[PDB]
Enzyme design. Structure first.
Site, PDB file in Angstrom:
ATOM      1  N   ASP A 152     -22.094 -13.730   0.192  1.00  0.00           N
ATOM      2  CA  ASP A 152     -23.516 -13.515  -0.093  1.00  0.00           C
ATOM      3  C   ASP A 152     -23.976 -12.190   0.491  1.00  0.00           C
ATOM      4  OD1 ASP A 152     -26.048 -13.919  -1.182  1.00  0.00           O
ATOM      5  OD2 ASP A 152     -26.716 -15.420   0.264  1.00  0.00           O
ATOM      6  N   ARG A 156     -30.857  -8.343   1.516  1.00  0.00           N
ATOM      7  CA  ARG A 156     -31.602  -9.456   2.139  1.00  0.00           C
ATOM      8  C   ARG A 156     -30.895 -10.126   3.324  1.00  0.00           C
ATOM      9  NH1 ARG A 156     -29.727 -11.088  -2.813  1.00  0.00           N
ATOM     10  NH2 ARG A 156     -28.198 -12.797  -2.732  1.00  0.00           N
ATOM     11  N   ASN A 157     -29.575  -9.942   3.416  1.00  0.00           N
ATOM     12  CA  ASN A 157     -28.774 -10.517   4.492  1.00  0.00           C
ATOM     13  C   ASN A 157     -28.250  -9.479   5.460  1.00  0.00           C
ATOM     14  OD1 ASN A 157     -29.067 -13.147   3.586  1.00  0.00           O
ATOM     15  ND2 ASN A 157     -27.384 -12.932   2.115  1.00  0.00           N
ATOM     16  N   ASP A 170     -25.745 -13.774   7.970  1.00  0.00           N
ATOM     17  CA  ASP A 170     -25.706 -14.860   6.998  1.00  0.00           C
ATOM     18  C   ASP A 170     -26.518 -16.040   7.541  1.00  0.00           C
ATOM     19  OD1 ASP A 170     -25.015 -15.883   4.511  1.00  0.00           O
ATOM     20  OD2 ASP A 170     -23.157 -16.784   5.239  1.00  0.00           O
TER      21      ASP A 170
HETATM   22  C1  LIG Z   1     -17.089 -18.184   3.453  1.00  0.00           C
HETATM   23  C2  LIG Z   1     -18.427 -18.076   4.068  1.00  0.00           C
HETATM   24  N1  LIG Z   1     -18.607 -16.967   4.999  1.00  0.00           N
HETATM   25  C3  LIG Z   1     -17.722 -17.118   6.159  1.00  0.00           C
HETATM   26  C4  LIG Z   1     -17.977 -16.019   7.175  1.00  0.00           C
HETATM   27  N2  LIG Z   1     -19.387 -16.013   7.581  1.00  0.00           N
HETATM   28  C5  LIG Z   1     -19.656 -14.987   8.587  1.00  0.00           C
HETATM   29  C6  LIG Z   1     -21.007 -15.165   9.233  1.00  0.00           C
HETATM   30  C7  LIG Z   1     -21.464 -16.432   9.561  1.00  0.00           C
HETATM   31  C8  LIG Z   1     -22.723 -16.616  10.092  1.00  0.00           C
HETATM   32  C9  LIG Z   1     -23.565 -15.532  10.289  1.00  0.00           C
HETATM   33  C10 LIG Z   1     -24.911 -15.595  10.920  1.00  0.00           C
HETATM   34  O1  LIG Z   1     -25.708 -14.686  10.757  1.00  0.00           O
HETATM   35  N3  LIG Z   1     -25.213 -16.743  11.563  1.00  0.00           N
HETATM   36  C11 LIG Z   1     -26.359 -16.994  12.350  1.00  0.00           C
HETATM   37  C12 LIG Z   1     -26.270 -17.411  13.666  1.00  0.00           C
HETATM   38  C13 LIG Z   1     -27.418 -17.615  14.402  1.00  0.00           C
HETATM   39  C14 LIG Z   1     -28.673 -17.385  13.863  1.00  0.00           C
HETATM   40  C15 LIG Z   1     -29.907 -17.551  14.702  1.00  0.00           C
HETATM   41  C16 LIG Z   1     -28.743 -16.992  12.526  1.00  0.00           C
HETATM   42  O2  LIG Z   1     -29.793 -16.482  11.838  1.00  0.00           O
HETATM   43  C17 LIG Z   1     -30.843 -15.697  12.212  1.00  0.00           C
HETATM   44  C18 LIG Z   1     -32.040 -15.906  11.561  1.00  0.00           C
HETATM   45  C19 LIG Z   1     -33.045 -14.965  11.646  1.00  0.00           C
HETATM   46  C20 LIG Z   1     -32.844 -13.838  12.413  1.00  0.00           C
HETATM   47  C21 LIG Z   1     -31.646 -13.631  13.086  1.00  0.00           C
HETATM   48  C22 LIG Z   1     -30.634 -14.569  12.989  1.00  0.00           C
HETATM   49  C23 LIG Z   1     -31.758 -12.341  13.835  1.00  0.00           C
HETATM   50  C24 LIG Z   1     -33.138 -11.860  13.489  1.00  0.00           C
HETATM   51  O3  LIG Z   1     -33.668 -10.828  13.847  1.00  0.00           O
HETATM   52  N4  LIG Z   1     -33.705 -12.789  12.676  1.00  0.00           N
HETATM   53  C25 LIG Z   1     -27.603 -16.811  11.774  1.00  0.00           C
HETATM   54  C26 LIG Z   1     -23.111 -14.260   9.979  1.00  0.00           C
HETATM   55  C27 LIG Z   1     -21.839 -14.068   9.457  1.00  0.00           C
HETATM   56  C28 LIG Z   1     -21.424 -12.679   9.118  1.00  0.00           C
HETATM   57  F1  LIG Z   1     -22.285 -11.794   9.460  1.00  0.00           F
HETATM   58  F2  LIG Z   1     -20.338 -12.358   9.659  1.00  0.00           F
HETATM   59  F3  LIG Z   1     -21.256 -12.509   7.888  1.00  0.00           F
HETATM   60  C29 LIG Z   1     -20.243 -15.844   6.411  1.00  0.00           C
HETATM   61  C30 LIG Z   1     -20.008 -16.952   5.437  1.00  0.00           C
END
Ligand SMILES: CCN1CCN(Cc2ccc(C(=O)Nc3ccc(C)c(Oc4ccc5c(c4)CC(=O)N5)c3)cc2C(F)(F)F)CC1
Length: 295
Positions: A152, A156-157, A170
């Site tokens: 994804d 936006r991400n 993500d």
């Molecule tokens: C096959 C599927 N794939 C596997 C690998 N994954 C990697 C992954 C997993 C989770 C996150 C992730 O991101 N998770 C996460 C964890 C904690 C929080 C709090 C969260 O989200 C937030 C929500 C809002 C805000 C933030 C985090 C920081 C901000 O300023 N606002 C997300 C990010 C990744 C990335 F970047 F590598 F691709 C992606 C999906």
């Protein structure tokens, strides 16, 4: 998994940021962060200013599977240490509710950020756009070489930190702002490679395809939805014409800011055969070197 939980007693609730099937995300402030500053929690403390963090929380009534998906994401997050990937600051896993704590990026997501700018003929320059895209490529290179597929990738991400630092993220949240970017067949079809749409084969090669569309968003400063000339059903039909590869398909047009060589790089990201799409190491090198050197 970190040895030790971040202490929940230190999280001061500010605001609910969103929600998904999994549970929810809160903005918290870390209470008296200077006392927590250690090797295990290296936090960037600024005397006189709140240390803000995002906290993703698994719903208490979560299923065995949801709980397992959540813990898989914890393990994954604990590994990812790279300047262009959102960073795990800590976890709370001993007790329920399970939590993941990340850095908070005050400039919001890349799409919001670029949508508020205009091109330097508040302004953003073409070199800066290449620098943004180079950082996404570098983050994706790191991901791919750790054998992770995003699935994804899109502006936006991506999150915007300080001094134009981009972090791939993500969220897993349902954000009404981007509902038109997803199609229930629930899939980000306008960013998806033909083989994903036609078969469900997700790979680093399909992440490269998405990177191409993401590069297009950036160079468009997020002013148009990719393939906005096609309805959702027609986007699916278009994927069929990529498989057909008789040249009938619609390609995203060259943004005004994009020179021909960069556009042709994007085109290769959309090559019908996965093996002809360039690897992220190549995409990064080309953005950080060739494109930057030929301004
Ligand atoms: C096959 C599927 N794939 C596997 C690998 N994954 C990697 C992954 C997993 C989770 C996150 C992730 O991101 N998770 C996460 C964890 C904690 C929080 C709090 C969260 O989200 C937030 C929500 C809002 C805000 C933030 C985090 C920081 C901000 O300023 N606002 C997300 C990010 C990744 C990335 F970047 F590598 F691709 C992606 C999906």
């Amino acid at each position: 998994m970190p040895r030790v939980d971040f202490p929940r007693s230190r999280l001061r609730f500010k605001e609910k940021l969103g929600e998904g099937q999994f549970g929810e995300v809160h903005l918290c402030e870390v209470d008296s962060p200077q006392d927590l500053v250690s090797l295990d929690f290296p936090l960037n403390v600024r005397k006189g200013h709140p240390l803000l963090v995002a906290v993703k929380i698994l719903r208490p009534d979560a299923t065995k599977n949801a709980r397992n998906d959540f813990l898989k994401e914890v393990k994954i997050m604990s590994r990812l240490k790279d300047p262009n990937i959102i960073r795990l600051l800590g976890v709370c896993v001993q007790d329920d509710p399970l939590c993941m704590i990340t850095d908070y990026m005050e400039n919001g997501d890349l799409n919001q950020f670029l949508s508020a700018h205009q091109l330097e003929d508040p302004t953003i320059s073409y070199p800066m756009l290449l620098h943004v895209a180079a950082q996404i490529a570098s983050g994706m290179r790191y991901l791919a070489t750790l054998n992770f597929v995003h699935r994804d990738l899109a502006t936006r991400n991506c999150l915007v930190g300080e001094n134009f630092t981009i972090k791939i993220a993500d969220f897993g949240m349902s954000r009404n702002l981007y509902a038109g970017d997803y199609y229930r067949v629930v899939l980000p079809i306008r960013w998806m490679a033909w083989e994903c749409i036609l078969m469900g084969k997700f790979t680093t090669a399909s992440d490269v395809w998405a990177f191409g569309v993401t590069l297009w968003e950036v160079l468009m400063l997020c002013r148009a939805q990719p393939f906005g000339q096609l309805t959702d059903e027609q986007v699916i039909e278009n994927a069929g014409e990529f498989f057909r590869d008789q040249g009938r398909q619609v390609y995203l047009s060259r943004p005004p800011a994009c020179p021909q060589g960069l556009y042709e790089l994007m085109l290769r990201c959309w090559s019908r055969e996965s093996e002809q799409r360039p690897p992220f190491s190549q995409l990064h090198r080309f953005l950080a070197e060739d494109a930057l050197n030929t301004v």
